[PDB]
Amino acid sequence: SLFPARCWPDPCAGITFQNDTYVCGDPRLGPVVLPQKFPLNNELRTYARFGALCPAEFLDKWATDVAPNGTYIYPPANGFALDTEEQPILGNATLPVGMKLDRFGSEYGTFLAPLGAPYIERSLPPSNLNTFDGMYPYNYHVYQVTKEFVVGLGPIAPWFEQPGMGTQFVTYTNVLGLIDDGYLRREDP
Amino acid sequence: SLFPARCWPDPCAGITFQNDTYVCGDPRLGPVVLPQKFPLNNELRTYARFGALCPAEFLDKWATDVAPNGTYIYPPANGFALDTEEQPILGNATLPVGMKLDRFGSEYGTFLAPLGAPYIERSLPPSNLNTFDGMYPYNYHVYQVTKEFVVGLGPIAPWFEQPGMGTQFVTYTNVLGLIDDGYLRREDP
Ligand SMILES: *[C@@H]1O[C@H](CO[C@@H]2O[C@@H](C)[C@@H](O)[C@@H](O)[C@@H]2O)[C@@H](O[C@@H]2O[C@H](CO)[C@@H](O[C@@H]3O[C@H](CO)[C@@H](O)[C@H](O[C@H]4O[C@H](CO)[C@@H](O)[C@H](O)[C@@H]4O)[C@@H]3O)[C@H](O)[C@H]2NC(C)=O)[C@H](O)[C@H]1NC(C)=O
Ligand SMILES: *[C@@H]1O[C@H](CO[C@@H]2O[C@@H](C)[C@@H](O)[C@@H](O)[C@@H]2O)[C@@H](O[C@@H]2O[C@H](CO)[C@@H](O)[C@H](O)[C@H]2NC(C)=O)[C@H](O)[C@H]1NC(C)=O
Ligand SMILES: *[C@@H]1O[C@H](CO)[C@@H](O)[C@H](O)[C@H]1NC(C)=O
Ligand SMILES: *[C@@H]1O[C@H](CO)[C@@H](O)[C@H](O)[C@H]1NC(C)=O
Ligand SMILES: *[C@@H]1O[C@H](CO)[C@@H](O)[C@H](O)[C@H]1NC(C)=O
Ligand SMILES: *[C@@H]1O[C@H](CO)[C@@H](O)[C@H](O)[C@H]1NC(C)=O
């Protein structure tokens, strides 16, 4: 189920091989071995890393180049779902003390999600699944709100062949600042 | 496990026993045997049916009465997350052909969700988990968008001791009329 069935016998057609840790040797396509602590699946919805596309089709559509120097293109309006007038749907909301948040990316960032939200809801590309220890994604962090503060709160638009429709929180201070001023604390999962 | 530890040695204290298929014999508290196909946990969080409350405390807080005639109290503003001005966060959005949706409730209803969203994201009470085939919840329906239509789309507020923060779709005609007119089609899960 790694690749759509149509992509056989040669699913890696068009992909330049860099390092055999990664699918078709390309880190953008995520790891062969997936981090054993994100399950991603249930009986109703499964994680199709490329959607119904084959790997090279997926890179051509969602990156600037299928070649290794291509980079992923991200959605407009900070990835918020768009209303019928093409405006992102969100509002300023207060996060309460005790709430559990997680994040893919460095603490220089400003985007969090609720702890544990399934991957396919986040519309993140495959390379966010790369790991260093097999347990967890290499850029995955978990936090707890320690003092109430206001964020932009709203639904996640579909992208990268994923359905999206989780909720995301866009902070007005980066995570490092929020930790330093006592709004968030780090938790190790 | 099923009940918080402090609730022992008599966790069903205060619950009137009706039928031994249900926890403490109360259908409002959901099935002893949970439907073996349905996604409760999200990725890293497990499903606590009562949160940290004991059963009788849970019904006192979330229902009109602990007695068997008590009915669940639902959140204001259709259960949308509220902004800092106490207004629901949402906008009108066009659902696209091909989108997969599901719903807990009769087709006389107006609320739908992305197919497969984890139960803990929906802020629904435990009795929506009651199952007669043991496989799927009794009131559970799956649909696919066959023609575009506009819904109210937004995040789900925490309620019933659950974290919420899935996305919900509120239709302007009940689900039945969307099916009859070719906007949705029924699917067997
Ligand atoms: C998102 O969309 C909903 C629903 O709008 C309906 O569905 C859409 C898919 C689309 O087809 C729309 O064309 C369609 O209206 C919006 O909710 C509705 O908002 C209207 C007004 O904006 C409400 O109508 C009001 O109803 C009142 C009684 O319940 C009544 O007092 C009002 O009458 C007055 O106003 C009219 C002019 O608007 C005037 O002619 C009258 O004589 C009188 O002065 C008014 O009719 C609906 O009740 C709302 N429907 C629901 C289900 O709530 C929603 O505003 C929109 N949201 C965003 C953010 O765009
Ligand atoms: C949500 O807030 C942002 C940012 O405003 C800051 O945070 C809020 C919680 C509130 O306390 C504000 O007073 C703070 O300044 C709003 O974006 C701002 O919009 C104004 C309007 O032109 C603009 O001058 C600022 O530069 C914007 N700031 C940023 C960081 O973009 C946003 O409009 C608010 N959304 C609402 C109220 O729905
Ligand atoms: C890249 O490939 C080399 C094999 O020469 C391997 O040692 C290394 O671990 C790979 N990089 C990873 C897994 O990040
Ligand atoms: C990326 O590499 C390909 C060659 O493999 C080249 O065609 C393309 O122009 C490159 N883009 C750059 C260097 O920005
Ligand atoms: C309880 O309810 C189920 C279905 O609602 C029914 O099959 C059963 O006979 C009822 N009574 C008992 C004692 O189980
Ligand atoms: C439910 O019935 C009980 C009798 O067992 C009664 O005390 C109570 O008033 C009823 N519920 C409400 C909300 O009135």
Numbering used by the authors:
A (entry chain A), B (entry chain B): 27 to 215
Passage from the reporting paper:
The majority of cellular NAD+ is generated in the salvage pathway, where the Nam released in signaling reactions is resynthesized into NAD+.4 Given its importance, NAD+ is targeted by toxins from many pathogenic microorganisms, including Streptococcus pyogenes and Mycobacterium tuberculosis. These toxins invade cells and act as NAD glycohydrolases, cleaving NAD+ into Nam and ADPR and rapidly depleting the cellular NAD pool, ultimately leading to cell death. In this context, we recently discovered a new fungal NADase on the surface of conidia from Aspergillus fumigatus (AfNADase), the predominant etiologic agent of Aspergillosis. The catalytic part of the TNT is structurally highly similar to AfNADase. Intriguingly, the active site architecture of the bacterial and fungal enzymes is conserved, but their structural superimposition reveals the presence of a unique C-terminal calcium-binding motif in AfNADase, which is located at the edge of the dimerization interface. In the present study, we addressed the structural and functional role of calcium binding by introducing mutations in the C-terminus of AfNADase that precluded the binding of the metal ion.
In the second variant, we created a chimeric NADase by replacing the 10 C-terminal amino acids, including the Ca2+-binding motif, with the C-terminus from N. crassa NADase (NcNADase). Importantly, NcNADase lacks the calcium binding site and as a result the chimeric protein, here referred to as AfNADase NcC-Term, is predicted to be unable to bind calcium. Compared to the wild-type enzyme, AfNADase NcC-Term showed a 5-fold decrease in affinity and a 66-fold reduced conversion rate (KM of 272.8 ± 48.6 μM and a Vmax of 69.8 ± 5.3 μmol/min/mg). In contrast, AfNADase NcC-Term showed a large shift in TM, from 71.4 to 57.9 °C for the wild-type and NcC-Term, respectively. These data suggest that at least in the AfNADase NcC-Term, the overall stability of the protein is affected by the modification of the C-terminus that eliminates the calcium binding site. The structure was chosen for the analysis based on the hypothesis that it represents a static conformation resembling dimer 2 of AfNADaseD219A/E220A. In line with this suggestion, the AfNADase NcC-Term variant (dimer 2-like), which lacks the ability to form the native-like C-terminal conformation, exhibits substantially decreased catalytic activity and thermostability.
